[PDB]
Amino acid sequence: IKGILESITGFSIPLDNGEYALYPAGRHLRGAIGYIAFNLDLPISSKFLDFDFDDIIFRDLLPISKCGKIFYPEKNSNSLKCPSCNIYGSSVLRNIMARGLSYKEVIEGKKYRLSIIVKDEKYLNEMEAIIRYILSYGIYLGNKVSKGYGKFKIKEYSIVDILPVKDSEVLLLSDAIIDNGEKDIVFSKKEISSSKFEIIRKRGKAKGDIIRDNNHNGFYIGYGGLGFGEIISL
RNA sequence: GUUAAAACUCUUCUCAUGCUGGAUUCGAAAUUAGGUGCGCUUCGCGUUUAAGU
């Protein structure tokens, strides 16, 4: 499901070592949508509760550019540049000190990609319902969801077919998970109506690196899915 | 079912002070208290004395 999301209120997603990432990741999208499906008792909730399901792949929200295409990551850096057009990064983070609380927030108004993929007919009605909900009443990503930070309304919704990358020469669009990886990817898995919190920290490989690997792992999928690692045709 | 949830950039501070709607210009110009009506009516300078010796 290809789409364009526009932020009217900005978002704040933190990382470790006092960094905040440029773009909202697909793990945040997933967590928001699974909350939203919980609030509407949609039949897929239990599956968003599971961190393993790979049928629905919520990719990462990547900043679209003036080109209209998707900005692509750059190895050994903290920015993304439309190969089509000469950069997104380290100029949209904005330092915020609010009644004691000091954090960082990525400024609003920029347009990001809403590209999810659905490999079964079991959800087209369900996703439809979630995009319809995201359309009429918005979605929220990041911190301070109940304070209105992270407002994200749709700007475009197209149900357009998708096909895997018929290339073993693939560039990592986002942070893949490998057993001996160097970038520690940290995320979390709450459990509402159970009061359970956990911080999932797993090693893996960073984005913007070309991988010469004949596996091809379906469409992207590096191994976590549910966000995590993506790939693009080089 | 988002390394989440939680937590209001809040509190203090008067657009205030200085400056006069003042200066110039005459309620003036034209018009006669004028027109009508008589100080009139009533009341004899009388009374008294020989041009004589």
Task: Give the resolution value in Å.
Answer: 2.9
Residues in chain A that come right before a backbone break, where C and next N are over 2.5 Å apart: 86, 222
- Cβ neighbours of residue A148 closer than 8 Å, sequence gap 6 or more: A9, A140
Structure tokens at A178: 């490998």
User: Hey, which bits of A30-149 come out as E strands?
Assistant: 56-58, 72-73, 80-81, 93-98, 101-106, 111-113, 116-118, 139-140
- Cβ neighbours of residue A156 closer than 8 Å, sequence gap 6 or more: A2, A3, A4
Å separating the CA of residue A27 from the C1' of nucleotide B17: 61
Are A200 and A187 spatial neighbours (Cβ–Cβ below 8 Å)? yes
Q: What technique solved it?
A: cryo-EM
CB proximity A207–strand B (7 Å threshold): no
Pairing of strands A56-58, A169-172: unpaired
Are A208 and A74 spatial neighbours (Cβ–Cβ below 8 Å)? yes
- The H or E element spanning position A135 is helix A124-137
CB proximity A101–strand B (7 Å threshold): yes
Structure tokens at A161: 């077919």
Å separating the CA of residue A234 from the C1' of nucleotide B35: 133
Å separating the CA of residue A47 from the C1' of nucleotide B33: 125
Give the span between the Cα atoms of A176 and A157, in whole angstroms.
27
User: Hey, which bits of A8-130 come out as E strands?
Assistant: 56-58, 72-73, 80-81, 93-98, 101-106, 111-113, 116-118
Å separating the CA of residue A85 from the C1' of nucleotide B51: 184
**Residue A29: exposure state from Cβ atoms within 10 A (0-12, 13-18, ≥19):** buried
Q: Give SS3 for A125.
A: helix
Within 7 Å of a protein beta carbon, the nucleotides of strand B are: 1-10
Give the span between the Cα atoms of A84 and A67, in whole angstroms.
7
| CA A226 to centroid of chain Cα atoms | 9
